């Protein structure tokens, strides 16, 4: 995961030569300078008469990116006749396969062809060129008197290569014996020492080779791919030979004893043409010192969720056991045609964590199929099948795509840090890329608190700025900078300690540190060598009990870590990274003993009582009601303390009053659950003994209907505690009452009348308004001002009429509205006024005989106006006095009322009574 | 009166067609900014716009030709018909659609396009001789399956490269069999000889004209040949309107992807056609073999069934390859290949369980959504096909033809055809966004009552 793709060392050669077919790394005992090897099969060179011979070029990884040919030769074809190749170095693909060890480089030409003096037939024997220091040797055991396809003529030695521990050379020759194949193996030392340039059929004394097989194995290609390892227990490494068309095109991998070409182990593919054996690699994946064998099968067809066959490529993993009984897992490509089995190669210990591992190439994957290489760690039980990181080609196809990862090598520490890189070929782009690894540090961090249980009275720490002491605790932070390979001895770790993380986000800060007087502290820690778990200690301050009501909620202490980079990096800028599976979030929880007596059992004494601010609710409107609820804690404290009150829906809860500083500010919810109506206040979950919380609960009581004489609220306080969870219930009632003030109003339309009315004359029997006099409309009204409606009232009117024997006001019509019905004792409109189209001074009802008019008034809503209008005429005869001039008069009527019945039958009811005088000034 | 386009289409002569199929636009001053505009056809019609100035296209689904579907392939004279609608008239307005359906029957008669791809290795010289009676006889037996069958021919001899070919170690192998007192051909990879033709007697002659070549490496180049025969529609003569039967005739195991490494062939096979003007696969020396994955994808995508006419001794590999190349079939070939006629007739009968549609020459602006009736009256959305049918069974596809935006005023022909079948539905599609109202406009300052503006499509602007 530590392999970057940001600053790779990018290698390339001349276009069309296919640089990238095979890669390797050269590390001679001769120097501190190492070189990358990249093969280029179609390369042109100096050798006269030879085209597309191929070449392997050596490149200095420290900048200096120029690649240069290895001088394995310079001459043209070995002759026999002049200018007649005895060997054809043209179109041979040199660099198709490249491998080295120490100061020896052996490059392959699988299409190297020979002429045998015996018969004029060109044969695809395949050979290698060995560069030993400055000495050059032709390696070709595949060339012998066995001139054709029946023989070794078709070996095509060179498709696969490796070396054993010490010095044996493994040359795969898949075309041998009618393409059954053959693995050719010899000590490189014998090859160098016994070589005679005038003989092209040199046999070696220690030469081993797979024997010719039955026709059963025709076209199997043993030698397509090869690897080495300690498969047959200890001793010399064995040979891992891929044979992709063995087992009827399923493919097989054979492991041959390194000392004798006789099969030890046999592995096979599950699917036809998967090509099980394209890539055979071996490594000790579990870190238990035994090589396993990982077999790529790039054409493997998997099955998707829809049953579709998906060409993804497979890597078949055979995990070694002492008994030779291999266990197995499978890795597979993700994308279609992203041939994942194309290459497997050692990465070595990518994190320096004790596990050897590999990387997998899927050369034709990615949108814009550049090729993807999958990097993951080994495990004691197998491979981590899921990539942590991938390397990807950065180049577009010129024609064919680069096929990134087609060829691959690794498990070499090229730079100063002992974290191996990956050399990933890209032959379709004439390129190879070195992806560098960062150091990987596993950091074991720990956080401990000694007095994990707190006591608020243990005030033993001095606070630096006061004469006062503090109850406190010791927080310890340790660090282990573990890492292998080469990493700087001293690592720089940045650590921050956060106290009370869960309360800082808007709640009261329960705890701070003594010296910084804040909930946080940080330091840059220098941790050296690994295992040196040095530490720092901080002392925390528990906040004063007089302000902080919290007793049960834990105090959490957190460590937050960052591994630095510039200050922990080497001279090439190769910064470390922490191990991908290591957390940087470490914590401990501390708690305070919540009272709980001497026996550590919480035994609360929960009690509640209330104070009513208002004693009455009036019926018919929304009556505010605030009740102060007092929550006591007379015993031990409590867990998840709450105030619960059962409230009739008719009493609409508004909230907890925040307009009085003498009261606690309690959060409060309103809900209905399982046929209930409730108000719930937050008394503080972690409650302490002695806490007194008072709060006002404000309601709006509607109750407009014919309800009970009081509104009842049922209150209790409770907890989730082990003992005594609920307080006794306090039952609170607020009286309900009928309030129905009614205002009696009235007015005479005109306030006054002037006697000299134009054309106003006396008639023995008057008709129409003109012969009677002015019309005055007297308005009487009952208005419901109070909130309570009523069912019945009466409006009583006394209309002055006969002063002495003079009839003054004749009622034309009673215009009434609302639920009103008038009954009169005396005849109304005795004068037959068909008009429509609408004690001397005070002519009161106690002076002039009055008419008694009583109006029944029915049900009236609050705010309703019950109206009585009396339209009447002033008759001339009774105003135009005859006895002595005239007098100013006040014509005075009187309207009284009495509200009798309310629908609120079960409530106290008071009669509502009053009266208004209505007058006209006649002058 | 006022209905949608009353406020959304009055400002535009075209938008009103785009907004609703029920709206109409008067012209020639029928209602010269009278009061209502656009509304519905009927509202303007009543308010003095009854004459055809209303220019009222609506979306329409009509059938131009519906010759009935046939029961038997033997029902000659009137053309045996495999599908029900033949020609359809579709009129769309912007952002709208119309429904139609395609009834297809597996009549005992859909057409067959068969390609005879032969192994031209030396052991087959006697097969080329036996095959001189085929084409004519193959088609004759097939006449009972369908009245219309075409036969082509090609061959394979493997990649002409160093390790597969006898390497041209000498010159002697540039024109081989000098070794045994005879002569034979050089290696060529994949060759195409005869495109499919109804004149099947041409095959008899074309095979007589052929002769074998020499292969050192026993595995055949059959997978390149199959993939090219599968992919190169333009030369093989595949009519989309016909079933494609690729017959692979051989006496040996095939060469597969990444085996090509032995010749220096490492180039991935992209599944593309590489057959040039010489009817030859030019990629035979640079490209690797296709994988089972590529074969499956291309033959499935393009509706090619493979028939493996393979001799008994190598059947195990071909049957196992078929399991990883779904949709294909493998039979057993006689050493004298005299049973190809029966092998194919049987293979065809075994293949016959699918109906799938393809729409040719569809423009980017129109989307055809399918719901396929695979069983009884149940339809599965997103399908152009149904599986599990027998000869004589039918399938019914429900299709929605929707247009996005307002494509140019050109008639397009959408050909909806079963793959496999001659008969197809030609849907002729036009777009009613552009109509007479646009031409019928004379702004001229005045005409917008007392003012200075424009006037179009029955409304001043």
């Amino acid at each position, epitope marked *: 995961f530590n392999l970057d793709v940001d600053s790779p060392a990018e290698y390339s050669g001349p276009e069309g030569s296919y640089f990238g077919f095979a890669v390797d790394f050269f590390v001679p005992s001769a120097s501190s300078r190492m070189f990358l090897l990249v093969g280029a099969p179609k390369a042109n060179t100096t050798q006269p008469g030879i085209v597309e011979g191929g070449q392997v070029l050596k490149c200095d990884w420290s900048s200096t990116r120029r690649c240069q040919p290895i001088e394995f030769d310079a001459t043209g074809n070995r002759d026999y006749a002049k*200018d007649d190749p005895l060997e054809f170095k043209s179109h041979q693909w040199f660099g198709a396969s490249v491998r080295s060890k120490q100061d020896k480089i052996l490059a392959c030409a699988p299409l190297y062809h020979w002429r045998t003096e*015996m*018969k*004029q037939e060109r044969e695809p024997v395949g050979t290698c060129f060995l560069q030993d220091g400055t000495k050059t040797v032709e390696y070709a055991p595949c060339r012998s008197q066995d001139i054709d396809a029946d023989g070794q003529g078709f070996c095509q030695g060179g498709f696969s290569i490796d070396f054993t521990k010490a010095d044996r050379v493994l040359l795969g020759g898949p075309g041998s014996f009618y393409w059954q194949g053959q693995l050719i193996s010899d000590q490189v030392a014998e090859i160098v020492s016994k070589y005679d340039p005038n003989v092209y059929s040199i046999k070696y004394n220690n030469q081993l080779a797979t024997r010719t097989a039955q026709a059963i194995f025709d076209d199997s290609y043993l030698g397509y791919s090869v690897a080495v390892g300690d498969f047959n227990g200890d001793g010399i490494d064995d040979f891992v030979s891929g044979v992709p068309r063995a087992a009827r095109t399923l493919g097989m991998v054979y492991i041959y004893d390194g000392k004798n070409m006789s099969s030890l182990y046999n592995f096979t593919g599950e699917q036809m043409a998967a090509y099980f054996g394209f890539s055979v690699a071996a490594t000790d994946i579990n870190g238990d010192d035994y090589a396993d064998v990982f077999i790529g099968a790039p054409l493997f067809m998997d099955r998707g969720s829809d049953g579709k066959l998906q060409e993804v490529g497979q890597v078949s993993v055979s995990l070694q056991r002492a008994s030779g009984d291999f266990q197995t897992t499978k890795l597979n490509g993700f994308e279609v045609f992203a041939r994942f089995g194309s290459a497997i190669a050692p990465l070595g210990d990518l994190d320096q964590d004790g596990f050897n591992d590999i990387a997998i190439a899927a050369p034709y994957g990615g949108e814009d199929k550049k090729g993807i290489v999958y990097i993951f760690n080994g495990r004691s039980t197998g491979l981590n099948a899921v990539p942590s990181q991938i390397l990807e080609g950065q180049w577009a196809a010129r024609s064919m795509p680069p096929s990134f990862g087609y060829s691959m090598k690794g498990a070499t520490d090229i730079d100063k840090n002992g974290y191996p890189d990956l050399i990933v070929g890209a032959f379709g782009v004439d390129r190879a890329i070195l992806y560098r690894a960062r150091p990987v540090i596993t950091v074991n961090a720990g956080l401990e608190v000694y007095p994990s249980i707190l006591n608020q009275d243990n005030k033993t720490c001095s606070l630096p700025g006061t004469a006062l002491k503090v109850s406190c605790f010791n927080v310890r932070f340790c660090l282990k900078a573990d890492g292998k390979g080469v990493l700087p001895r001293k690592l720089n770790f940045q650590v921050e300690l956060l106290l009370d993380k869960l309360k800082q986000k808007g709640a009261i800060r329960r705890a701070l540190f003594l010296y910084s007087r804040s909930p946080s502290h940080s330091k840059n820690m220098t941790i050296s060598r690994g295992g040196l778990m040095q530490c720092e200690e901080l002392i925390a301050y528990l906040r004063d009990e007089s302000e902080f009501r919290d007793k049960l909620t834990p105090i959490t202490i957190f460590m937050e870590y960052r591994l630095d980079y510039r200050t922990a990096a080497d001279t090439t800028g190769l910064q470390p990274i922490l191990n991908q599976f290591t957390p940087a979030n470490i914590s401990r929880q501390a708690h305070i003993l919540l009272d709980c007596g001497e026996d550590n059992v919480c035994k609360p004494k929960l009690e509640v009582s209330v104070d009513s601010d208002q004693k009455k609710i009036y019926i018919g409107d929304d009556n505010p009601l605030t009740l102060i609820v007092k929550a006591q804690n007379q015993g031990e404290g409590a867990y998840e303390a709450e105030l619960i009150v059962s409230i009739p829906l008719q009493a609409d809860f508004i909230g907890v009053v925040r307009n009085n500083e003498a009261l606690a500010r309690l959060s409060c919810a309103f809900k209905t659950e399982n046929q209930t109506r409730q108000v719930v206040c937050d008394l503080g979950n972690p409650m302490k003994a002695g806490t007194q919380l008072l709060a006002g609960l404000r309601f709006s009581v509607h109750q407009q209907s014919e309800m009970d004489t009081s509104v009842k609220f049922d209150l209790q306080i409770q907890s989730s505690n082990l003992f005594d969870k609920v307080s006794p219930v306090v039952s609170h009632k607020v009286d309900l009452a009928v309030l129905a003030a009614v205002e009696i109003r009235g007015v005479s339309s005109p306030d006054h009348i002037f006697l000299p009315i134009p054309n106003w004359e006396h008639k023995e029997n008057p008709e129409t308004e003109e012969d009677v006099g002015p019309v005055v409309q007297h308005i009487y009204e009952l208005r419901n001002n109070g909130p309570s409606s009523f069912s019945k009232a009466m409006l009583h009117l006394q209309w002055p009429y006969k002063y002495n024997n003079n009839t003054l006001l004749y009622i034309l019509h009673y215009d009434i509205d609302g639920p009103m019905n008038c009954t009169s004792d005396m005849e109304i409109n005795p004068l037959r006024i068909k008009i429509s189209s609408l004690d001397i001074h005070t002519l009161g009802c106690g002076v002039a005989q009055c008419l008694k008019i009583v109006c029944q008034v029915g049900r009236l809503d609050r705010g309703k106006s019950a109206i009585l209008y009396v339209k009447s005429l002033l008759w001339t005869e009774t105003f135009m006095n005859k006895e002595n001039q005239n007098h100013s008069y006040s014509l005075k009527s009187s309207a009284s009322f009495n509200v009798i019945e309310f629908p609120y039958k079960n409530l106290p009811i008071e009669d509502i009574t009053n009266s208004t005088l209505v007058t006209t000034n006649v002058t | 009166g006022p209905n949608i386009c009353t406020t959304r289409g009055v400002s535009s002569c075209q938008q009103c067609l785009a907004v609703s199929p029920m709206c109409a636009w008067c012209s020639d001053e029928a209602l010269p900014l009278g009061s209502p505009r656009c509304d519905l056809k009927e509202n303007l019609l009543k308010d003095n716009c009854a004459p055809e100035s209303i220019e009222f296209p609506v979306s329409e689904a009509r059938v131009l030709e519906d010759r009935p579907l046939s029961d038997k392939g033997s029902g000659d004279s009137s053309q045996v018909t495999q599908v029900s609608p033949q020609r359809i008239a579709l009129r769309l307005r912007p952002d709208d659609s119309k429904n139609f359906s395609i009834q297809v029957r597996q009549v005992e008669d859909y057409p067959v396009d068969i390609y005879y791809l032969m192994d031209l290795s030396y052991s087959m010289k006697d097969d080329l001789w036996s095959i001189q009676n085929l084409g004519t006889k193959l088609a004759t037996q097939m006449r009972k399956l369908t009245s219309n069958l075409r036969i082509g021919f090609g061959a394979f001899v493997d990649k002409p490269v160093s390790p597969y070919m006898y390497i041209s170690p000498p010159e002697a192998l540039e024109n081989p069999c000098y070794d*045994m007192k005879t*002569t034979c051909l050089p290696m060529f990879g994949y060759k195409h000889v005869l495109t499919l033709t109804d004149q099947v007697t041409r095959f008899n002659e074309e095979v007589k004209k052929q002769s074998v070549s020499r292969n050192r490496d026993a595995p055949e180049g059959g997978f390149d040949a199959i993939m090219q025969a599968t992919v190169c529609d333009e030369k093989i003569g595949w009519r989309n309107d016909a079933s494609h039967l690729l017959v692979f005739t051989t006496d040996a195991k095939t060469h597969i992807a990444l085996d090509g490494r032995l010749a220096g062939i490492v180039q991935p096979n992209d599944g593309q056609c590489h057959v040039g003007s010489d009817n030859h696969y030019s990629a035979s020396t640079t490209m690797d073999y296709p994988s089972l994955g590529l074969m499956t994808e291309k033959l499935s995508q393009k509706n090619i069934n493979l028939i493996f006419a393979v001799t008994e001794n190598v059947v195990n590999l071909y049957q196992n390859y078929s399991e990883l190349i779904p949709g294909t079939t493998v039979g057993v070939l006689s050493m004298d290949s005299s049973n190809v006629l029966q092998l194919i007739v049987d293979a065809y009968g075994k293949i016959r369980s699918k109906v799938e549609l393809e729409v040719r020459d569809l423009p980017e602006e129109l989307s055809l959504s399918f719901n396929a009736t695979c069983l009884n009256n149940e339809v599965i959305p997103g399908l152009k096909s149904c599986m599990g049918l027998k000869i004589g069974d039918t399938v019914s596809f429900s299709i929605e033809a929707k247009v996005r935006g307002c494509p140019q005023e050109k008639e397009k022909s959408f050909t909806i055809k079963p793959v496999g079948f001659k008969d197809s539905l030609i849907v002729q599609v036009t777009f009613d966004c552009d109509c007479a109202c646009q031409a019928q406009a004379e702004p001229n300052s005045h005409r917008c009552n007392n003012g200075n503006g424009t006037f179009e499509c029955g409304v001043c602007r």
Partner: antibody
Amino acid sequence: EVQLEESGGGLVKPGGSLKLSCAASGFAFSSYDMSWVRQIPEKRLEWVAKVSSGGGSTYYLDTVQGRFTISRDNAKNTLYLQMSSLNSEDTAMYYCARHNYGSFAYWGQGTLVTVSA
Amino acid sequence: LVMTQTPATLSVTPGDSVSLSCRASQSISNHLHWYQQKSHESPRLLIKYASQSISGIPSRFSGSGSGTDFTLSINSVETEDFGMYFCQQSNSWPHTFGGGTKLEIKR
């Protein structure tokens, strides 16, 4: 070193018969094809007949076929050519030769055959 | 098939260079060999397969060509190069030889 030696040439009356032989050594005789080439008095070389390494396939010049037989004994390392119904056209120096894939890599010294009355 | 070989005769002074030309009536790919024959001696293979020399044949002798037209070039002709030259076709039965070229040394 390859050694080829022809013998048995001489004067044959027209319509007669004659057997030529050619001994061989210095090589794996049974691993190579063999042929006879004759040099016509006009100094023109003409290929006459070829026999495959195992003796299985034998090819003859069209104007020779039906009259001559080419054969070999791979145990005795000796090549033979049995001529019959000889005409004047058959007078020539006959040479045995070893093949290298269509070329005549090695030749004998030649045995002269005269057809005349 | 007919193999035409020209020139029939050639007179070359030592140190000068020459060439011979082989014409086939049809294409014979690279199935063309060249031989030399000195007085009272048998023919010897010079060049095989149109351009591949043999084992002890001088570089001075160089074959070239394909299909229908082949050559044999001899650089810096030596006295010892005197003698007949023949081309031979190995493509199709019967094998055929060219008429042959008689190389003479000019003195």
